[PDB]
Design an enzyme around this catalytic site. Sequence first.
Site, PDB file in Angstrom:
ATOM      1  CB  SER A 110      -1.077  -0.096   1.078  1.00 50.76           C
ATOM      2  OG  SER A 110      -1.949   0.907   0.988  1.00 50.76           O
ATOM      3  CG  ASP A 226      -7.674  -2.971  -2.836  1.00 51.01           C
ATOM      4  OD1 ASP A 226      -8.228  -1.972  -2.129  1.00 51.01           O
ATOM      5  OD2 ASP A 226      -6.513  -3.020  -2.838  1.00 51.01           O
ATOM      6  CG  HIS A 256      -5.879  -2.376   0.807  1.00 51.61           C
ATOM      7  ND1 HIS A 256      -5.141  -1.797   1.740  1.00 51.61           N
ATOM      8  CD2 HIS A 256      -5.480  -1.915  -0.515  1.00 51.61           C
ATOM      9  CE1 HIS A 256      -4.245  -0.877   1.060  1.00 51.61           C
ATOM     10  NE2 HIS A 256      -4.184  -1.204  -0.056  1.00 51.61           N
TER      11      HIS A 256
END
EC number: 3.1.1.23
Length: 279
Positions: A110, A226, A256
């Site tokens: 991320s 996601d 995610h």
Amino acid sequence: MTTTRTERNFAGIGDVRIVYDVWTPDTAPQAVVVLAHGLGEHARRYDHVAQRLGAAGLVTYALDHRGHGRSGGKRVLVRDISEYTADFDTLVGIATREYPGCKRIVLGHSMGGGIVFAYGVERPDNYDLMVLSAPAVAAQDLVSPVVAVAAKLLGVVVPGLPVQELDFTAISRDPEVVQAYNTDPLVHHGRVPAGIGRALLQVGETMPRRAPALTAPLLVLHGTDDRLIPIEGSRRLVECVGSADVQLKEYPGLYHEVFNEPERNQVLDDVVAWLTERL
Ligand SMILES: COc1ccc(-n2nc(C(=O)N3CC[C@@H](O)C3)cc2-c2ccccc2Cl)cc1
């Protein structure tokens, strides 16, 4: 396999104390992994990842970024992407000096995938393999124009100004993962700040122009469901990188945090298989 954790620290940029874990398996070290967590979390949300990588003979180094976890700094404060990439580089150097015969793997999730990407385009010769989980490499497609202006204009002077809500229910479809995130006193429970927003916009705005500088192999992992970072951004990333050995593994129905999803052991088996054959 037994993979043992040892906790260490170094002085990061601005003389911020950076804490990191080293996870060492009881087998000959086949490579080193340098791991970057994402926004608001910390490296102790990766114990199971490090333990699985250790079962494959890999030594994992994982820092708490400035402003996160056990490290110093104002919480979630950053004034330039280079602060994060500089401390990541320091960790890569520690791992390189401790295991000078080993291949080097850089891994990020991320925001941490944005950091690792940014690192890799700056130092494309300084690692052997890259693995990205849902990398934040197109932040400009994720926030409104108003939020992007605020972050761009204020993220150096008022880096802690809140600019964007984060839907923490989107991190995983396992409610116990969501609960463990929400109750963790070391996790940031507030909004995305201007400084991090700006830093990720620095990465996103030029990703297509910079990604050709990648030369080393790349594996990207992304859940199709996601809602925090749309999967089409990882599809775009893999079209832009330079390296021929590039693959996006899409996981149908995953949220995610693919490494924390119910299917995490399959995701991690895929990562280990990809890494092992490339050492
Ligand atoms: C639409 O709302 C949002 C969409 C994405 C994110 N986002 N999440 C991370 C992230 O690293 N993690 C999410 C939880 C954990 O899995 C790690 C980074 C970002 C991000 C987004 C924009 C600018 C800057 C950043 Cl850093 C936050 C809110």
